[PDB]
Design an enzyme around this catalytic site. Sequence first.
Site, PDB file in Angstrom:
ATOM      1  N   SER A   1      12.394  -4.289   0.326  1.00 29.72           N
ATOM      2  CA  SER A   1      13.159  -3.360  -0.491  1.00 29.72           C
ATOM      3  C   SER A   1      13.033  -3.740  -1.958  1.00 29.72           C
ATOM      4  CB  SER A   1      14.630  -3.345  -0.068  1.00 29.72           C
ATOM      5  OG  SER A   1      15.228  -4.608  -0.295  1.00 29.72           O
TER       6      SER A   1
ATOM      7  N   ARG B   1      12.177   1.861  -2.009  1.00 29.48           N
ATOM      8  CA  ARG B   1      10.852   1.260  -1.920  1.00 29.48           C
ATOM      9  C   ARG B   1      10.179   1.711  -0.633  1.00 29.48           C
ATOM     10  NH1 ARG B   1       8.314  -2.839  -4.543  1.00 29.48           N
ATOM     11  NH2 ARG B   1      10.238  -3.787  -5.336  1.00 29.48           N
TER      12      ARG B   1
ATOM     13  N   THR C   1      13.758  -0.260   5.038  1.00 30.00           N
ATOM     14  CA  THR C   1      14.645  -0.090   3.899  1.00 30.00           C
ATOM     15  C   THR C   1      16.088  -0.248   4.355  1.00 30.00           C
ATOM     16  OG1 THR C   1      13.039   1.469   2.966  1.00 30.00           O
ATOM     17  CG2 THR C   1      15.208   1.411   1.947  1.00 30.00           C
TER      18      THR C   1
ATOM     19  N   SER D   1      15.152  -2.519   8.231  1.00 31.80           N
ATOM     20  CA  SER D   1      14.570  -3.851   8.350  1.00 31.80           C
ATOM     21  C   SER D   1      15.476  -4.898   7.717  1.00 31.80           C
ATOM     22  CB  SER D   1      13.184  -3.877   7.706  1.00 31.80           C
ATOM     23  OG  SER D   1      12.638  -5.183   7.734  1.00 31.80           O
TER      24      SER D   1
ATOM     25  N   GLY E   1      12.114   3.409   8.587  1.00 35.38           N
ATOM     26  CA  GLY E   1      10.926   3.093   9.352  1.00 35.38           C
ATOM     27  C   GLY E   1      10.127   4.318   9.742  1.00 35.38           C
TER      28      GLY E   1
ATOM     29  N   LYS F   1      15.078   8.387   0.059  1.00 34.81           N
ATOM     30  CA  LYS F   1      15.445   8.082   1.434  1.00 34.81           C
ATOM     31  C   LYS F   1      16.609   8.932   1.922  1.00 34.81           C
ATOM     32  CE  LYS F   1      12.461   5.392   3.056  1.00 34.81           C
ATOM     33  NZ  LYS F   1      12.464   3.907   3.010  1.00 34.81           N
TER      34      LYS F   1
ATOM     35  N   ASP G   1      17.875   2.212  -0.448  1.00 36.94           N
ATOM     36  CA  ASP G   1      16.948   1.771  -1.474  1.00 36.94           C
ATOM     37  C   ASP G   1      15.726   2.690  -1.495  1.00 36.94           C
ATOM     38  OD1 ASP G   1      15.505   0.477  -3.356  1.00 36.94           O
ATOM     39  OD2 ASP G   1      15.395  -1.453  -2.327  1.00 36.94           O
TER      40      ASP G   1
ATOM     41  N   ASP H   1      15.681  -9.904   0.218  1.00 33.61           N
ATOM     42  CA  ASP H   1      14.746  -9.386   1.211  1.00 33.61           C
ATOM     43  C   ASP H   1      13.432  -9.060   0.516  1.00 33.61           C
ATOM     44  OD1 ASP H   1      13.413  -7.435   3.170  1.00 33.61           O
ATOM     45  OD2 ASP H   1      15.188  -8.071   4.297  1.00 33.61           O
TER      46      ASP H   1
END
Lengths: 229, 118, 44, 122, 203, 262, 234, 197, 248
Positions: free
Chosen positions: F211, F61, F43, F171, F89, F75, F59, F208
């Site tokens: 996300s 997701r 994320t 990421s 991660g 998050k 984000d 990307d």
Amino acid sequence: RGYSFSLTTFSPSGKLVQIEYALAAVAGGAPSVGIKAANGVVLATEKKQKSILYDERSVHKVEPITKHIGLVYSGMGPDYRVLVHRARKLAQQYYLVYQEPIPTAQLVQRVASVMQEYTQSGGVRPFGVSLLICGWNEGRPYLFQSDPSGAYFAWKATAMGKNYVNGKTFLEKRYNEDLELEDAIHTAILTLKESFEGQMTEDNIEVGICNEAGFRRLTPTEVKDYLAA
Amino acid sequence: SPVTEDLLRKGFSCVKNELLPSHPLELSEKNFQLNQDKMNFSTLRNIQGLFAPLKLQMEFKAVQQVQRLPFLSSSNLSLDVLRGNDETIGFEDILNDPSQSEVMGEPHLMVEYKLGLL
Amino acid sequence: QNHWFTYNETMTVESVTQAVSNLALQFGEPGAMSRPFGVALLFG
Amino acid sequence: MSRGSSAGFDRHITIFSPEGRLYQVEYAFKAINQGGLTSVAVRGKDCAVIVTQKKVPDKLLDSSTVTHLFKITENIGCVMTGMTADSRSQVQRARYEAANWKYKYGYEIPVDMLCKRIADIS
Amino acid sequence: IMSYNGGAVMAMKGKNCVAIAADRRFGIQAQMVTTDFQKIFPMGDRLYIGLAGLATDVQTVAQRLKFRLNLYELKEGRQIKPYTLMSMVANLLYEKRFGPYYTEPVIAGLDPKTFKPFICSLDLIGCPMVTDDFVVSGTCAEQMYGMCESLWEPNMDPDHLFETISQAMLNAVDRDAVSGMGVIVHIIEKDKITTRTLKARMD
Amino acid sequence: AAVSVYAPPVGGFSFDNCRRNAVLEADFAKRGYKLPKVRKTGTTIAGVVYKDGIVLGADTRATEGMVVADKNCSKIHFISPNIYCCGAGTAADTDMTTQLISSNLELHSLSTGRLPRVVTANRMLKQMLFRYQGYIGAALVLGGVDVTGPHLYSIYPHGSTDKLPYVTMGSGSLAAMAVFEDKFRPDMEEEEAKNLVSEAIAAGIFNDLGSGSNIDLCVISKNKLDFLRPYTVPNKKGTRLGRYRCEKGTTAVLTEKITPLE
Amino acid sequence: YDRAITVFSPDGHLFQVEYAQEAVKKGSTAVGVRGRDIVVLGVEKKSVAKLQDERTVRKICALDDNVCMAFAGLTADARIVINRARVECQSHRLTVEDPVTVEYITRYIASLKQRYTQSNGRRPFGISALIVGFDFDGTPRLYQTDPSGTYHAWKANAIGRGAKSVREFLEKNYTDEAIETDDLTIKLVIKALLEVVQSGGKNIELAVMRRDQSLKILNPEEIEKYVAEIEKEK
Amino acid sequence: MEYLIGIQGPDYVLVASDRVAASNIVQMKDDHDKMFKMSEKILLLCVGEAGDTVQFAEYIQKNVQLYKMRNGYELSPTAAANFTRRNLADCLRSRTPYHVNLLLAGYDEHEGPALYYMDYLAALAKAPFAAHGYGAFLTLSILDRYYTPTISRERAVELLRKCLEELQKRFILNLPTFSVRIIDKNGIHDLDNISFP
Amino acid sequence: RRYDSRTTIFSPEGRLYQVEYAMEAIGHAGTCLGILANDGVLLAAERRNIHKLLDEVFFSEKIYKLNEDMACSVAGITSDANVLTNELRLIAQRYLLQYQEPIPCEQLVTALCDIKQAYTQFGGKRPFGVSLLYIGWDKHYGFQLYQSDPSGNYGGWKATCIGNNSAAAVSMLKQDYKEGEMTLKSALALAIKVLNKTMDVSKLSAEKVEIATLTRENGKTVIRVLKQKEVEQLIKKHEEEEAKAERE
């Protein structure tokens, strides 16, 4: 008496001399009063720092735990800070697991067990201290008192400390339940006044409430306002 | 590398893989307090003198032998402020807390093993 | 028996009296003893 | 320890008095005056002056290695009073504790934490 | 590694009703040795758990969780809130994070005081997360999100909830070799528990 | 109880599975069977230091491979009244390794009576992460205001640390941090900083695969702590056209049991 | 000079052992005698206590399918010793596929007793055993432990308070004729136990063991019948 | 490799076996009883890697007699299974790469018989008829085809005989003769061996 | 004599004096009933703390709940009972984890008596002062009750009474027990009569007693505590029966 001098031996009548001696020691300390009311609880005590050489900040008696548990000692000063630190560590240990704050009863049981653990052993003295702790869980107020051996009670109006018999007799005719904190604070102040050896001043009362917000500790000017009123 | 010079009491443990460490975070987790204490003792002995590690370790020994018997949970209220971990809660007390031990031994056997008689 | 297994020969009486006396010498302060061995032997 | 604890109401630390007073620690309080000294520390509003007393038993003893004012951290002092053989150890213990705290939290210690640590380990 | 055995479990939150369902099969890879093997455990009264994955660790984790739940229930007095078991299993799984277990539990139940339905989920090593509408985990994870996303609907009565949980499993689990041959449906309404056994293709 | 126990049990991370796990993995690797996976929630995380306070954001997701496991997963965690962190991660590890430090700092704050300082959190996190050399990966973005001034940190999964005025970890991060590199200027204002971080996170979310869904911001200014969630909805699901609900009696039944509770 | 196990006296006479023996000589009695192929292990119950249940309070414990047990003294220490003996018997059977002989297990019990006499921080086990059972070769065997460390392969001895009288009675009547059949041994042991007890049948328990038939306690009806049969003396 | 089957019924837990040994290319012994005995009502079949099987069975067998001899009464098949599984799991995961298969049996006095199937990763099912070894593949279908839910003791032997004839005719290995034991509410009964000339 | 300073030394006559002295500690606690009936297993209690400033707590202060069926009652130094009850709960749950059956009585009573005795053989620790009274049901021996001892002398008692005034209560129970034929209502009436016979004769009330039962029904053993208003009518009925003595 030969059967005394050691806490690991029973006297030939059934007792523990060291435990009773420690109980008398913690009785010979500083008066403290705790009142349970339908809306909350109040803990009142006074300090020996009468001379102006001392300071209001720094050293302090009623140390909060987390957000809902607050205590007060009536025994040996340098002999409860370790216990308080252990209580806070236990509260956090319970909080990492079971992601919800400690209920009072489990904390009382754990601290009572850890305090008792220095009774049954051999070669270490028992803690000389006896502390009340107040909680607020499930929309209910909780009050408990701990003994040097360790036996929690669901007390309601204990006035343990120096000259506690007079405090108990005075409180056994004033409390009548169904009260707010406003009258409870005045009752606690009167109980302290009954045995204080002098007059209360702006810097001699450390009242702390535990209403349904947390464990706010009353500011010195607020204590002055209540004392005047 | 020892020869024999009761298998029901202690059994079902092949010699093959105790001299073969598991996932590399094995010797750094099975023996952690001992290693940290050894490092601190070495540092103090190097920089402050020979008195401090001797005094501190013999204090550890003096305070260690007042706990309850091994077949019951130890409060360990003391020795903690002296160790320095008074408030350093970590991955040592919230995971597999020894109070709720899943398996438990016999009292006499455990106490006699703690005494080192066996 | 351990000595026979190791060195592959027979015992000498002094070589076993020395061993048993060395074991019995441990009186004092670990499954160590705490009292002298109130016994006596006539090895032959 | 193979010597036991001496029997008596005031002969050891772990035995309570009949009324509930620790007599050994009271003897410890009385023990400071045995050496014989006086120390005064006064804080104003922007200074923390400390004064003490120095006594030379004789003339041969050097006057530069008898001080009773040690240094704990870069900006903390001490006016240790009493038996020298024990202050000389508490000073080292406090220095080690201060260094450990600075290593574990990365800033100079407030005085209260050092005082509390010393009080607990005492 | 969650292919040495089989399993699949859902959970849907309706209107004061929660439904949990599983699949009954236990077999060593291609072979099959039995048809009855419970994967739903009655922890509490209006609460349930839905372990699904490698069976030899499912049994062990169920036993340990039941032990700790009994301990907490007996010590603390009253029943356990549904949110507490979430952190319970999270801690139990993270106990062996380096030596990981093989379980993807699902928890579904009701609050004993508020009667507000609750559903959560877990990954392999313990990572708490709560989804309002539904959640699903198992060996055949891929072939259920598509079946569930369209068929779902908010504010469903118990009958429609049972129909949806039946239709999202009965014709969505047969599209796979392992993890078939039988479906158990547990519907937990406000006052009484009810269990049903569907019938599916015997292949 | 048991008859084959000598020493008392010792807590900590257990390790009585790797011996079986290795041989099982060797068995199942060459046979083309399913493989375990964890929620490697790659994320984007963004943070900027404006004139007064700090602004954070990430984000929401949470994937577990090629399948979208979750559509709403916070998050942003809580550490202290005026310190926030972020994860990136292996969310399972980051949750616990942030909660532990949060509890430790709470204990320290209770024992001190004053607000904690960010450097303490940095030191404790660095010590723990370096103690567990590798084998645990949680890239963090530690930010918070203290008695001295604004601060920011960029802890790595091996123990490295930095003090950047802006940082982007995760990421998919290059897009957002390039937007920062293009638009950022020193000593901005509050609303401008919020707009900038929102734009950067929007670029990262669009360009990307790891996300998606909603975004949020965590303004932690000096005398006002804010936690906006969600802040903006960039994507909205459409609507189902035809009703596919099944009526009563659609599904068959074999056996049925009814048990009444109380 | 009697306040620690490790210390001696000016003459010798390790006194803690003697005091433990005195403590052992305070509980209920116990007897035992072997025959051609039979062993009896009768004991006597000090108090009736009809409210109490005789199922839980008992002395004739089982140690193996070929070894039985009867103690006298403090109950808890005897229970601990019996538990350890059971565990050791099972461990020996596991390590060698051969039913354990009487001598090995009685030596293990004696060693376990003797181990708790080597430091002034552990009191000795004050009990006395009557280990008796059948070996793997068929030879009847009997033994008797002792608190200090000792054991003897007795034949028809007895322990407990008032043991001198019963021992004299047994030694004045033990002959090869009385050990020929099965019920003759029961008659002899009942006649022996009838001395110390006030009234027979009320508080007397037996445990007849045969060749590989395992331990088998006797119901009160059979005890009453045996007493009635032995009451035909003329 | 080897062969283990067990068929349930109304009041029996009948189990077969395969009295045979193993080596490189040689048959060391042609009659090796694999049927360890737990108590008067419990059997324990075990086929696995050499040595580890006879060690684990011996250890788990000199542990159930302890319970009986220490508590007077006897265990139940369900407790025996839930104990054997736990021991196997804890020991296998601890330090030893075991490979053992087990097939418990038993007849309690409250709920009929009980037959338990356990793989080498310590699972626990309650199948009404299971199998082990390699002959399971070729014989489980035969067992399933004729298995009426209720089978008389007389017909169980015939079904077993057919299931073993098919294996002896269509298998690579040379299992020469089999053993048969049936458990009822009278102890551990025995039947004449099944030998193929 | 002088041979009682430490709990590791015998006596010239032969006796452990320290444990004998500790046996007198349980003589300063409230009485405890617990007669056994055919169906249920009643368990009375006594609340020493009768002060006017005590708030009620769940499950009284004596009766506990071990795993699902077994309860206990303590006596003596209460500061050492919270450890025993916790460890006993732990051992029960550990046995359940081992074998998936409800625990029998022996594998609990013996298990706890082991520790209780082990603290009387490793001098340096005072023995626990407790008189735990047990209760429970299983499927191997029906209903049964056990009474413990600080040294450890557990016996399968059918009806006993620990605590102060134990001698008179036990004797009168022995003289007035209908062995063999016994019902729950008659057992409760006998328990009330025994409690009135003992104690300082204060006529009792709902604020001085606690009663627990173990009625097993519907294949699910339950433990229930009678309500505060569920004993006042019982006391009134007993008083009416006592006053209905006729005589002249």
